[PDB]
């Protein structure tokens, strides 16, 4: 028979809806004054993602250090400008874009992405380079990230360039990592909340079958399972169309709350199985928020 889950499961086809790396998103190239740079290009927001700077006095949302201290000290965020472009609260962005009907009423995540995307590096009128952003969903503030790099942790170097890695840390729970490509309609086409009493499956001959091969990792709670899925997810950087994942990777997990097992897999799921012991998560999903009821499929 025909699959009734099609429309519902569309947001879980990560390769199609996001289409780039999750752990490290560097799915496009852009130019600044003749030089090419790799930059984020995922279409979905990444809930709970931040950057851990190894052996640092501050967090990544601290502005970049200046002059020769750039990339040694400070954080990743845009330095103070005249007028101040970053950080910008939700209210300040809506006021700043008040003359633009296409931007002023965008949802907060899309607005933060468009605001970051308005900054031209070096005022190079030919540049297509668009800074990513971090939205703090608790304080309702948009932080433009000056640094688009997400991982620098080779055993080699890790006074000199700082070492860092992407992560879903408990302190990043209200942060949302945004590429320049974050879609207007993310709420309808992208994952956010984890699915309580649901297990991802594969639709075969009129029935939702279990994922036939999973990679089992132990996890004390849902947050730790989401951290694990994130760590193993699509990455546009080899861990420490060149290295472009295009959204391919271990982006899905079925968390068994009873056996404390995070069952990680790398193919798109095509249906849901109602199972009281499970929570269905993705690398993109919020690390804590759950959708309380199993969906009613017509």
């Amino acid at each position: 028979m025909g699959n009734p889950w099609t429309e519902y499961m569309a947001k879980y086809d990560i390769e199609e809806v996001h289409g780039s790396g999750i752990r490290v998103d560097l799915g496009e190239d852009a130019e600044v004054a003749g030089t090419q740079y790799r930059l984020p290009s995922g279409k979905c927001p990444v809930f709970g993602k931040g950057i851990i700077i190894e052996n640092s006095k501050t967090t990544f949302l601290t502005p970049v250090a200046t002059g020769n201290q750039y990339l040694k000290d400070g954080g990743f965020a845009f330095p103070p400008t005249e007028p101040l472009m970053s950080p910008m609260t939700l209210d300040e962005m809506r006021h700043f874009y008040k003359d633009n009907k296409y931007v002023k009423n965008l949802d907060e995540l899309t607005l933060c992405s468009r605001h970051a995307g308005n900054m031209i590096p070096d005022n190079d009128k030919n540049s297509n380079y668009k800074y990513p952003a971090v939205y703090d969903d608790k304080d309702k503030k948009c932080h433009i990230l000056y640094i688009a790099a997400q991982e620098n942790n080779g055993p080699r170097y890790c006074n000199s360039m700082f070492c860092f890695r992407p992560a879903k840390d408990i302190s990043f729970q209200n942060y949302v990592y945004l590429s320049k490509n974050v879609v207007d309609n993310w709420e309808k086409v992208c994952p956010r909340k984890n699915l309580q009493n649901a297990k991802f499956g594969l639709w075969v001959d009129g029935n939702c079958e279990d994922i036939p091969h999973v990679n089992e990792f132990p996890a004390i709670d849902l947050f730790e399972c989401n951290k694990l899925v994130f760590e193993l997810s699509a990455s546009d950087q080899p861990k420490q169309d060149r290295y472009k994942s295009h959204g391919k990777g271990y982006n899905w997990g079925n968390y068994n709350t009873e056996t404390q097992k995070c069952e990680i897999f790398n193919v798109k799921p095509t249906c849901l199985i109602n199972d009281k012991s499970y929570i269905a998560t993705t690398a993109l999903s919020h690390p804590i928020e759950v959708e309380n009821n199993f969906p009613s499929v017509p």
Partner: peptide, 7 residues
């Protein structure tokens, strides 16, 4: 170091 914005 303070950065200005231009149109």
């Amino acid at each position: 170091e303070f950065l200005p914005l231009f149109s």
